[PDB]
């Protein structure tokens, strides 16, 4: 039984009414549970059998639905409700879960400030070159980073890492690291990072010339 | 109050086996079922199976047939999950939960990491001006990273450690400071790696 | 073989097999296929065996007749206490010896302060006994059904506070509610019927495997909203 949650990501503010839906591939009557999970913590049962509130769970959480379509409603969303929510069927084996709905804090659109770091001389000695592009304090989380080496679009040689939403300003930060051998790094001059984000009128390019 | 306490995090090489334990306290686990659920890094939840320690009956998800062994010791109120022929895809947090169909009570989760790479140490490379610090090619996790031994908390973004093609983790950290200060302010990045006891402290200069 | 007996409102054990559709439902209390949602096809063969079959333990697979949930003596009420529990069920006095799910929960006499947690719908039973006769042993009837379903059963009441037992056109049409107020009072609180049809399918599965020990001429069962 395939469980499909909608949306996968949801942006909301304190006090908002929030609705998360769960679609089962076949009818599961009312055999459905809802869980909350925070990073680095175990899931927490909220609702069992579609609409029954688990003891110790605040009344602001309510479940509804039957058959194939289910709804988790959070009435006045509180700060501690920003987490990932999962639905789970318990009708047939194996017990299966939805892919989760991450509930993040709304903020106004903020364009990233972009920075490019050449590999250090210290790293170059070891025979490896890491070129780092930083996208700092942006919102929403969606961003596109494109690497160009002497105007040649790079593919499969970069890794991105995104921070969790900031506790003070509700923004995201992202690092894109281009990895090359010292040999490949020394045969090229222009290293550029191109950033596409909602807050930017046009994609922004930060670059340097090797040496 | 009923509590489920799991064994500590595991580091395993491919082909090896892991055995995770879960101790129940408060309740006398005679009238209950203990379930095993795993969660791969950025992924969702996956049920592996269950056990009723009173009569020792176990049930498993088909995809874990032959590789998983679920047992329990009535006298110690403890359930065990043994997973054999370990693969890199088995790297996950393994949760112990109580209830068969729905779980109100959970364990804290045991982190198992399958990697054919040895407990190698990190190497710090500085990023000069926004100023950064790079922590490259270390195994396993975690790495501490505080600036000016903790002083500089203001505008610091510590990135989660992404796995490389080599099989080694790479974390990075960056701070946002003013352009005037750079020349005077001797900004330092400090990183502690405890599995390989590396206490590297580095300085950034443009 | 016996097509003339399929759905003839009389159970014939010679035709009571999954192939012959449990004698056209006549031997499964009008439940077509009690295992219709069960993901494993040969679960009915393992339903009657007094042993846990984990692959047949899902709610769809009718909890493998509770043999995974209640493995030991707690699977049944003690027969030496069975008449006592029937005589003292829902008499307004707490009898702790009958205050277990297998004995019928003393008809909730010990849990007057726990709010009702009713399952969805009404359990409808046709019993070939006149309403007067049926209600003359109603506590025994409810206690035994409560003991079988491992939950609390009571007569649904109408606007005038009367039990919803109607003449059958001969017999009775009995309307029951399932109160899970103590089912969900743990330990394994997941082995609880969420609705009246679930309970009706389970009763049909017991009648199909000839393991229903109910001293009443029960013809059929169904769940209704
Ligand atoms: C079901 O179990 C009871 C136990 O007494 C037995 O009498 C009955 O014959 C069994 N039914 C089948 C079809 O095996
Ligand atoms: Ca017949
Ligand atoms: Ca069985
Ligand atoms: Ca009583």
Short mmCIF file of C-alpha atoms in Angstrom, two decimals, chain C residues 6-202:
data_model
loop_
_atom_site.label_atom_id
_atom_site.label_comp_id
_atom_site.label_asym_id
_atom_site.label_seq_id
_atom_site.Cartn_x
_atom_site.Cartn_y
_atom_site.Cartn_z
CA UNK C 6 -25.74 -21.98 -1.69
CA UNK C 7 -27.56 -19.05 -0.01
CA UNK C 8 -30.52 -21.25 1.10
CA UNK C 9 -30.59 -19.54 4.60
CA UNK C 10 -29.52 -22.90 6.21
CA UNK C 11 -25.87 -23.81 7.01
CA UNK C 12 -24.68 -27.08 5.36
CA UNK C 13 -21.13 -28.08 6.64
CA UNK C 14 -20.57 -30.29 3.49
CA UNK C 15 -20.68 -27.05 1.41
CA UNK C 16 -18.85 -24.95 4.03
CA UNK C 17 -15.50 -24.36 2.24
CA UNK C 18 -13.84 -21.24 0.69
CA UNK C 19 -14.46 -22.71 -2.80
CA UNK C 20 -18.22 -22.96 -2.15
CA UNK C 21 -18.11 -19.46 -0.53
CA UNK C 22 -18.79 -20.76 3.02
CA UNK C 23 -22.07 -22.35 1.72
CA UNK C 24 -22.99 -19.07 -0.01
CA UNK C 25 -22.54 -17.11 3.22
CA UNK C 26 -25.05 -19.38 5.19
CA UNK C 27 -22.27 -20.75 7.34
CA UNK C 28 -20.43 -17.36 7.72
CA UNK C 29 -23.42 -15.41 9.13
CA UNK C 30 -24.20 -13.78 5.64
CA UNK C 31 -20.65 -12.38 5.41
CA UNK C 32 -19.60 -13.14 1.83
CA UNK C 33 -15.81 -13.33 2.44
CA UNK C 34 -14.73 -12.46 6.02
CA UNK C 35 -11.11 -12.40 4.65
CA UNK C 36 -12.00 -10.21 1.54
CA UNK C 37 -9.34 -7.55 2.42
CA UNK C 38 -6.75 -10.07 3.79
CA UNK C 39 -3.57 -9.79 1.71
CA UNK C 40 -2.63 -13.53 2.15
CA UNK C 41 -5.03 -16.06 0.57
CA UNK C 42 -4.54 -19.11 2.79
CA UNK C 43 -5.11 -17.32 6.15
CA UNK C 44 -8.50 -19.02 6.91
CA UNK C 45 -6.63 -22.41 7.15
CA UNK C 46 -4.51 -20.91 9.97
CA UNK C 47 -7.44 -19.05 11.70
CA UNK C 48 -8.60 -22.13 13.71
CA UNK C 49 -5.12 -23.51 14.77
CA UNK C 50 -4.74 -21.91 18.34
CA UNK C 51 -1.29 -20.57 17.30
CA UNK C 52 0.18 -17.26 16.18
CA UNK C 53 0.63 -16.91 12.41
CA UNK C 54 2.20 -13.45 12.07
CA UNK C 55 1.53 -13.20 8.31
CA UNK C 56 -2.22 -13.51 9.13
CA UNK C 57 -2.19 -11.07 12.10
CA UNK C 58 -3.21 -7.80 10.30
CA UNK C 59 -6.73 -6.30 10.95
CA UNK C 60 -7.59 -7.24 7.25
CA UNK C 61 -6.65 -10.85 8.17
CA UNK C 62 -8.93 -10.74 11.28
CA UNK C 63 -6.00 -10.64 13.83
CA UNK C 64 -5.38 -14.40 13.19
CA UNK C 65 -8.36 -15.04 15.60
CA UNK C 66 -6.44 -13.11 18.34
CA UNK C 67 -3.83 -15.93 18.64
CA UNK C 68 -0.95 -13.46 18.32
CA UNK C 69 -2.58 -10.99 20.79
CA UNK C 70 -3.89 -13.46 23.43
CA UNK C 71 -1.56 -16.46 23.22
CA UNK C 72 -2.06 -17.92 26.74
CA UNK C 73 -4.97 -18.70 29.16
CA UNK C 74 -6.17 -15.07 28.84
CA UNK C 75 -7.56 -16.17 25.42
CA UNK C 76 -10.71 -17.39 27.20
CA UNK C 77 -12.81 -16.65 30.29
CA UNK C 78 -12.59 -19.46 32.90
CA UNK C 79 -15.68 -21.79 32.41
CA UNK C 80 -16.03 -22.09 36.20
CA UNK C 81 -16.55 -18.24 36.28
CA UNK C 82 -18.58 -18.14 33.02
CA UNK C 83 -22.14 -18.53 34.65
CA UNK C 84 -21.18 -16.06 37.47
CA UNK C 85 -19.96 -13.45 34.91
CA UNK C 86 -23.20 -13.84 32.84
CA UNK C 87 -25.32 -13.44 36.01
CA UNK C 88 -23.34 -10.35 37.21
CA UNK C 89 -22.71 -8.55 33.84
CA UNK C 90 -23.95 -4.91 33.77
CA UNK C 91 -25.80 -5.33 37.13
CA UNK C 92 -24.52 -1.96 38.40
CA UNK C 93 -22.01 -3.59 40.81
CA UNK C 94 -18.28 -3.95 40.13
CA UNK C 95 -17.22 -7.66 39.99
CA UNK C 96 -13.39 -7.63 39.54
CA UNK C 97 -13.21 -11.34 38.57
CA UNK C 98 -15.26 -10.49 35.43
CA UNK C 99 -13.34 -7.21 34.82
CA UNK C 100 -11.15 -8.61 31.94
CA UNK C 101 -11.67 -8.40 28.13
CA UNK C 102 -12.03 -12.20 27.79
CA UNK C 103 -14.90 -12.32 30.41
CA UNK C 104 -16.86 -9.34 28.97
CA UNK C 105 -15.46 -6.45 31.15
CA UNK C 106 -18.31 -6.90 33.75
CA UNK C 107 -20.51 -4.98 31.28
CA UNK C 108 -18.53 -1.81 32.24
CA UNK C 109 -19.74 -1.87 35.93
CA UNK C 110 -16.11 -1.17 37.02
CA UNK C 111 -15.58 1.63 34.48
CA UNK C 112 -18.64 3.90 35.03
CA UNK C 113 -16.22 6.93 35.17
CA UNK C 114 -14.46 6.16 31.81
CA UNK C 115 -16.27 7.91 28.89
CA UNK C 116 -17.75 5.83 26.06
CA UNK C 117 -15.54 5.30 23.01
CA UNK C 118 -18.00 3.72 20.54
CA UNK C 119 -16.87 2.02 17.37
CA UNK C 120 -18.33 3.38 14.07
CA UNK C 121 -21.80 2.02 13.16
CA UNK C 122 -24.28 -0.47 14.62
CA UNK C 123 -23.84 -4.27 14.80
CA UNK C 124 -27.04 -5.88 13.51
CA UNK C 125 -27.81 -9.48 14.50
CA UNK C 126 -30.69 -11.71 13.45
CA UNK C 127 -31.38 -14.26 16.20
CA UNK C 128 -34.11 -16.90 15.63
CA UNK C 129 -35.62 -16.28 19.06
CA UNK C 130 -38.62 -13.93 19.81
CA UNK C 131 -37.71 -10.49 21.29
CA UNK C 132 -39.22 -11.35 24.72
CA UNK C 133 -37.16 -14.61 25.00
CA UNK C 134 -33.95 -12.90 23.76
CA UNK C 135 -34.23 -10.09 26.33
CA UNK C 136 -35.03 -12.57 29.14
CA UNK C 137 -31.34 -13.63 28.89
CA UNK C 138 -29.94 -10.31 27.50
CA UNK C 139 -27.09 -9.93 30.06
CA UNK C 140 -25.90 -13.53 29.18
CA UNK C 141 -26.23 -12.67 25.45
CA UNK C 142 -24.19 -9.42 25.71
CA UNK C 143 -21.64 -10.92 28.10
CA UNK C 144 -20.93 -13.85 25.74
CA UNK C 145 -20.71 -11.56 22.66
CA UNK C 146 -18.46 -9.15 24.65
CA UNK C 147 -16.22 -12.10 25.63
CA UNK C 148 -15.98 -13.27 21.94
CA UNK C 149 -15.23 -9.81 20.46
CA UNK C 150 -12.90 -9.01 23.41
CA UNK C 151 -14.68 -5.63 23.83
CA UNK C 152 -17.84 -4.22 25.44
CA UNK C 153 -21.19 -4.79 23.72
CA UNK C 154 -24.52 -3.15 24.67
CA UNK C 155 -27.97 -2.75 23.07
CA UNK C 156 -28.36 0.43 21.05
CA UNK C 157 -31.12 2.46 22.78
CA UNK C 158 -33.91 4.39 20.95
CA UNK C 159 -35.35 7.92 21.75
CA UNK C 160 -37.54 6.38 24.52
CA UNK C 161 -34.46 4.68 26.09
CA UNK C 162 -35.55 1.20 24.97
CA UNK C 163 -33.26 -1.56 23.63
CA UNK C 164 -33.39 -1.74 19.81
CA UNK C 165 -34.65 -5.36 19.57
CA UNK C 166 -37.33 -5.79 16.90
CA UNK C 167 -39.42 -8.84 15.79
CA UNK C 168 -38.06 -10.64 12.72
CA UNK C 169 -40.51 -11.81 9.99
CA UNK C 170 -39.99 -16.04 14.22
CA UNK C 171 -36.90 -14.15 15.52
CA UNK C 172 -35.27 -10.82 16.39
CA UNK C 173 -33.31 -8.01 14.72
CA UNK C 174 -30.88 -6.93 17.49
CA UNK C 175 -28.99 -3.62 17.22
CA UNK C 176 -25.75 -3.41 19.19
CA UNK C 177 -23.12 -0.79 19.89
CA UNK C 178 -19.42 -1.58 20.55
CA UNK C 179 -17.90 0.45 23.40
CA UNK C 180 -14.09 0.31 23.17
CA UNK C 181 -13.56 2.45 26.37
CA UNK C 182 -11.50 -0.38 27.95
CA UNK C 183 -10.16 -1.95 24.73
CA UNK C 184 -8.05 1.21 24.23
CA UNK C 185 -7.10 1.11 27.89
CA UNK C 186 -4.10 -0.95 26.61
CA UNK C 187 -1.90 -3.13 26.81
CA UNK C 188 -2.06 -4.04 23.09
CA UNK C 189 -4.79 -1.53 22.28
CA UNK C 190 -4.56 -2.05 18.41
CA UNK C 191 -6.60 -5.34 18.46
CA UNK C 192 -9.83 -3.25 18.76
CA UNK C 193 -12.65 -3.23 16.22
CA UNK C 194 -12.91 0.29 14.70
CA UNK C 195 -16.43 -0.36 13.29
CA UNK C 196 -19.41 -2.77 13.43
CA UNK C 197 -18.59 -4.41 10.00
CA UNK C 198 -15.10 -5.42 11.26
CA UNK C 199 -16.74 -7.18 14.24
CA UNK C 200 -19.40 -8.77 11.91
CA UNK C 201 -16.62 -10.14 9.57
CA UNK C 202 -14.72 -11.55 12.58
#
